[PDB]
RNA sequence: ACCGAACCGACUAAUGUUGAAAAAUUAGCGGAUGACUUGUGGCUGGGGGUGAAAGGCCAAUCAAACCGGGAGAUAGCUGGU
RNA sequence: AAAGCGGGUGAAAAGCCCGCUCGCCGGAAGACCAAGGGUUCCUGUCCAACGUUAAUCGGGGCAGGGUGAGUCGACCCCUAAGGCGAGGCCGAAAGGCGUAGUCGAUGGGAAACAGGUUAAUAUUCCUGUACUUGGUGUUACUGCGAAGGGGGGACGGAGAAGGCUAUGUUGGCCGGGCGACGGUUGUCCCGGUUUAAGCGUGUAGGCUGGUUUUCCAGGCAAAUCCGGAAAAUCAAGGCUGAGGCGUGAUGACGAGGCACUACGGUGCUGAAGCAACAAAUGCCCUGCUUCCAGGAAAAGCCUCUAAGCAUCAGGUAACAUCAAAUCGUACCCCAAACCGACACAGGUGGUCAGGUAGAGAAUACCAAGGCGCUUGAGAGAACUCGGGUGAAGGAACUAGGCAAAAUGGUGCCGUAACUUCGGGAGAAGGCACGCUGAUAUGUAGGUGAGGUCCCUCGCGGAUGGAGCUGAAAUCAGUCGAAGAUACCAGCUGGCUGCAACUGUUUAUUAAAAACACAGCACUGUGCAAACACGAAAGUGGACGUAUACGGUGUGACGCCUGCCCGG
């Protein structure tokens, strides 16, 4: 499936 | 009354094993492989009238099939019934 | 963790068994579809 | 009696309970009990049709004689009993011929009393007469709507129906809603207010007491989401809507009675 | 009601994060006769259910499940030719 | 949770087998099941593949064996929730509901225990001793009969105590020992001291007044049954019931001793086999007391009659005989066999419940019993993880005392503001605590033999204290740095926001001030109720009736809730 650090929100939305 | 057709069909085979031999030499019991749709009364009548002996009681159990492998092709050895027939101390087949 | 399959033969047979398939009208359609495909096993009974 | 509990715990601080020493303490009458299963507010389709019903204590139904049809035979009121299916107390009453029945207990009736039904019965509480025989101005309860149907009006605890007029074949009853209704003069009615008036003075004291009576919690539409209730939504606490039921009909003032079949019988609304 | 095991839960910290585990371990933590918890069985079905209400849950999937079908939807867009 | 060594087998041994140690669990990591799985069970043989290494081993391959029932469970009779549903009501069709019925356990219904045996089954086989239901046939008496009436089955939460038992400890008795190193013929050490269902008696306890007449608008008709009414008469009659005792049992079992062994285990014999005390969460007890939230149904069972049969059938009691079929029974079951893709630190319902200390099912160490977690051997860098201790200082760290450290038990003294008079409160704070002797060769208390007396006469009562068990306290002495010595086991106080409180919530980053709440107000609703599900029939609301039900908002309690109808 998918990696947890890609599902996470604090590190994915790192540069809004 | 149970017909001779039915009796001659229900008795299938004797059974040979260490436990069957011990039962014969200890409790005057014979072990018979029996067709599956035979009841205790049918086995008792068949033994009593075909082996010319006399039966105290009969005990039945169904032996389950075995899952086997023949060249990576799965198969299933079939069921049969086993009968422990007890005789009245003076028959000695 | 408790997973989604907690098996029970009675509930299995009342839900997906052959007599429930024949009881509902669309279950008979399910059996028709599986027979037309040619399944070895139609329902969960065998 | 109305007895306040001492505040030895936060749940028991506000509790007011009604204790009645005259009630029977043993088991009720096995010939007259029945089972009823709880529904949870679910109909034969299985859907919740009435919200906030479910759980509570298990109960047994008591067959209560609302018809009061055994006329001409005097009856001895034996004992008062707790019925869990209604607010009022029931009374196990022994007729003179050996058959026992459950009736509603009117106010003032006690153990070992005399009651009697029929057209020739005396005018005293507990006695059942047709309202053509019942004098005007007198308070009755357990009032019928159709002759022989059974009692349907003034059946909860402490309620009564006042006969104000008799015009030909119909009598006018003032009902506890304040409502004037014409009913047939042949309909039966039992004299006297229903007992257990102190039932209205109870305080449950806790959510546990409500759940014992069998009512699930009520969620406000203003706390729901917009997809759930017409009131739901808002950042913070926002309402901005006219108050409606969850299916969209206005719920503060909008009248919902529409029965042109019984508009002929209704004389005055409850105002 | 109170303290505290079973049992139910999940407040804090560290570890783990291609893990022993697609949500746990360790040390502490809350309830623990009640609006409690649990076994077997039944019922409610997708614009529907159920919801002490978080758009939560409905088989590791939910601002509308899964499966097959209209279906080779459409794509003024990207890639390839 | 942890291994070491000796021997055996083998081509080869850290892992397999045997032995001696060492360690871990022991309300489980032990034993038995239900659910689920399906041969994983036992024996012989093999090491390609599977096993996170090797392999002689295995839950792997191959072959053979193994599951024995009138009494256990299913099947079967009976119903719950609910399902299906002849006719029927309804709906474009399909189909929706539903009466009579008929299914549906998670519940109600008859009966077996102890010992022994197999490599693998046993409440199933064998030995011993029992019990249940039904059919047939003799004997004796006789009003039998339901799809109907009645009783019963038949029922909640909490609490308290009495009587007991399982069970344990000690004593007695029986068998054995006189100790690798000071002492050990003694108040010394080790072990054993088990016995069931059934049958007989009916005790502690619990419930209820019996017995005989006459009458009756009730129990869909009848009733000798149930209910009701009026008399007479008697006072102990009935029902239920743990345990104990006798029998079952001159039997079985029994530490050990004796002899073979294919050293794995077999064959023979066998003493004592009692008492006191402590004691359950188990039994009497589906009891008793109390509370409000007022606590399944039907059949089996007992009983009464209708139609009918009427010296027949049928019923009751004894005896004899026959029958009780069919299916499951191996093995795992807190797990390497079930659900998690794995021989996966997860999950999974019930039953049993030993010793010491302890309030205890916590916890520490142990017993029965089971394991050492399928890679090891070295070395003793940085660094990471889990811990231990630390001079002086003591929050100076940091967003923040996060984390860690500390407090921690029983008895007594004592304890503030505030308060809804309950609380706050274990407020805060302090003192004692080990061991030996004496009071007292072991006390107060508990249990209670022998003996004696009495009797409506035995499982009886009064006296009486043998014996057993046994706190707590005071005084004196003594040891240590320290006596709740380990494990286990509150940090406390002050000001304040919010929500009254217990609870519920985003399974899987949010447990909150959100949701709920008891209480309050408005409003709808007269019953064929409003309202909801449904093209409809129906159903919930409710077998409820305005002191009730639905909707909406606020949220205990105290003081309050002011003006505006223009939109
Ligand atoms: N990383 C954590 C938490 C986690 C699981 N799934 C996630 C998905 C998204 C973010 C975090 C997670 C874990 O592996 O258990
Ligand atoms: Mg036999
Ligand atoms: Mg069998
Ligand atoms: Mg409501
Ligand atoms: Mg409310
Ligand atoms: Mg919201
Ligand atoms: Mg809307
Ligand atoms: Mg705002
Ligand atoms: Mg505004
Ligand atoms: Mg509590
Ligand atoms: Mg939760
Ligand atoms: Mg959290
Ligand atoms: Mg934890
Ligand atoms: Mg608490
Ligand atoms: Mg607690
Ligand atoms: Mg939102
Ligand atoms: Mg999911
Ligand atoms: Mg959509
Ligand atoms: Mg198209
Ligand atoms: Mg496409
Ligand atoms: Mg070796
Ligand atoms: Mg090893
Ligand atoms: Mg070994
Ligand atoms: Mg240990
Ligand atoms: Mg196999
Ligand atoms: Mg094996
Ligand atoms: Mg090799
Ligand atoms: Mg290998
Ligand atoms: Mg094998
Ligand atoms: Mg039914
Ligand atoms: Mg039909
Ligand atoms: Mg139907
Ligand atoms: Mg049936
Ligand atoms: Mg059952
Ligand atoms: Mg075995
Ligand atoms: Mg004893
Ligand atoms: Mg208990
Ligand atoms: Mg077994
Ligand atoms: Mg392993
Ligand atoms: Mg595991
Ligand atoms: Mg558990
Ligand atoms: Mg423990
Ligand atoms: Mg190191
Ligand atoms: Mg460190
Ligand atoms: Mg430290
Ligand atoms: Mg320091
Ligand atoms: Mg220091
Ligand atoms: Mg300091
Ligand atoms: Mg700084
Ligand atoms: Mg600072
Ligand atoms: Mg901390
Ligand atoms: Mg610590
Ligand atoms: Mg002392
Ligand atoms: Mg502030
Ligand atoms: Mg709160
Ligand atoms: Mg969460
Ligand atoms: Mg609010
Ligand atoms: Mg105002």
Instruction: Pick the closest to residue D250 from D241, D258, D259 (CA basis).
Output: D241
**Residue B37 CB partners (closer than 8 Å, separation 6+):** none
In this complex, the nucleotide whose C1' atom is nearest to the CA atom of residue C7 is: F36
Measured CA distances, C21 to C17, C24, C45, D225 (Å): 6, 6, 11, 40
Token pair for D95: 């007729």
Tokens 């909008």 locate to D254
- CB-side neighbour CA atoms (13 Å) of D65: 21
Please name the fold of domain B2-93. Alpha-Beta Plaits (3.30.70)
Determination approach: cryo-EM
The residues of chain D that CATH labels 2.40.50.140 are: 1-113
d(CA C40, CA C29): 17
| Residue of A1, A2, A5, A7 to mutate, ligand 1, most atoms within 8 A of C-beta | A7
Q: Tell me which DSSP letter residue B65 carries.
A: P
Q: Identify the architecture of domain D1-113 in CATH.
A: Beta Barrel (2.40)
Which nucleotide is at minimal CA–C1' distance from D8? F422
Protein-contacted bases of chain E (C-beta within 7 A): 1, 17-18, 21-24, 34-36, 40-45, 49-55, 59-60, 63-64
Compute the distance between CA of residue D81 and CA of residue D86 in angstroms, rounded to an integer. Answer: 12
CATH 4.10.950.10, chain D: domain bounds: 195-271
Cβ of residue D233 near strand F, that is under 7 Å? Answer: no
Task: Give every CB contact of residue D87 below 8 A, 6+ residues apart in sequence.
Answer: D156, D157, D196, D199
A10 touches strand E (CB under 7 A): no
CATH 4.10.950.10 is held by the domain D195-271: yes
B69: CB within 7 A of chain F nucleic strand: yes
Resolution (A): 2.9
Instruction: Look at the block and give the residue holding tokens 């917009």.
Output: D226
CA-based nearest residue to D90, from D169, D13, D15, D32 = D32
Q: Taking the domain C1-46, which CATH number applies?
A: 1.10.287.3980
Q: How far is the CA of D136 from the C1' of F466 (A)?
A: 91
**For D41, what's the count of Cα atoms within 13 Å in the CB-facing half-sphere?**
12
């Amino acid at each position: 499936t998918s990696k947890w650090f890609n599902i996470d929100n604090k590190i994915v939305d790192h540069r809004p | 009354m149970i017909r001779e057709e039915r009796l001659l069909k229900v008795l299938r085979a004797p059974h040979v094993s260490e436990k069957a031999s011990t039962a014969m030499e200890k409790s005057n019991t014979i072990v018979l492989k029996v067709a599956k749709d035979a009841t205790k009364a049918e086995i008792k009548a068949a033994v009593q009238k075909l082996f010319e002996v006399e039966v105290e009681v009969v005990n039945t159990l169904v032996v389950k099939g075995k899952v086997k492998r023949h060249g990576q092709r799965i198969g299933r050895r079939s069921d049969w019934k086993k009968a422990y027939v007890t005789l009245k101390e003076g028959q000695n087949l | 963790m408790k997973r989604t399959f907690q098996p029970s033969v009675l509930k299995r047979n009342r839900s997906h068994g052959f007599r429930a398939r024949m009881a509902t009208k669309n279950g008979r359609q399910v059996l028709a579809r599986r027979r037309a495909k040619g399944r070895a096993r139609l329902t969960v009974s065998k | 009696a109305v007895v306040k509990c001492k505040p030895t715990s936060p749940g028991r601080r506000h509790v007011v309970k009604v204790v009645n020493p005259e009630l029977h303490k043993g088991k009720p009458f096995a010939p007259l009990l029945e089972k009823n299963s709880k529904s949870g507010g679910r109909n034969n389709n299985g859907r919740i049709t009435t919200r906030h019903i479910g759980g509570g204590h298990k109960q047994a139904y008591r067959i209560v004689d609302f018809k009061r049809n055994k006329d001409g035979i005097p009856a001895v009121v034996e004992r008062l009993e707790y019925d869990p299916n209604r607010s009022a107390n029931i009374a196990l009453v022994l007729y003179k011929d050996g058959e026992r029945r459950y009736i509603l207990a009117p106010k003032g009736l006690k153990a070992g009393d005399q009651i009697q039904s029929g057209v020739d019965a005396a005018i005293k509480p507990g006695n059942t007469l047709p309202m053509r025989n019942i004098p005007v101005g007198s308070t009755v309860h357990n009032v019928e709507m159709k002759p022989g149907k059974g009692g349907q009006l003034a059946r909860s605890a402490g309620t009564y129906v006042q006969i104000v007029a008799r015009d030909g074949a119909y009598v006018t009853l003032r009902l506890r809603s304040g409502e004037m209704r014409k009913v047939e003069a042949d309909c039966r009615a039992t004299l006297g207010e229903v007992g257990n008036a102190e039932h209205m003075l109870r305080v449950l004291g806790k959510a546990g007491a409500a759940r014992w009576r069998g009512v699930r919690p009520t969620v406000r539409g203003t706390a729901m989401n917009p997809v759930d209730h017409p009131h739901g939504g808002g950042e913070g606490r926002n309402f901005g809507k006219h108050p409606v039921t969850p299916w969209g009909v206005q719920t503060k003032g909008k009248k919902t009675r529409s029965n042109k079949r019984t508009d002929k019988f209704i004389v005055r609304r409850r105002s």
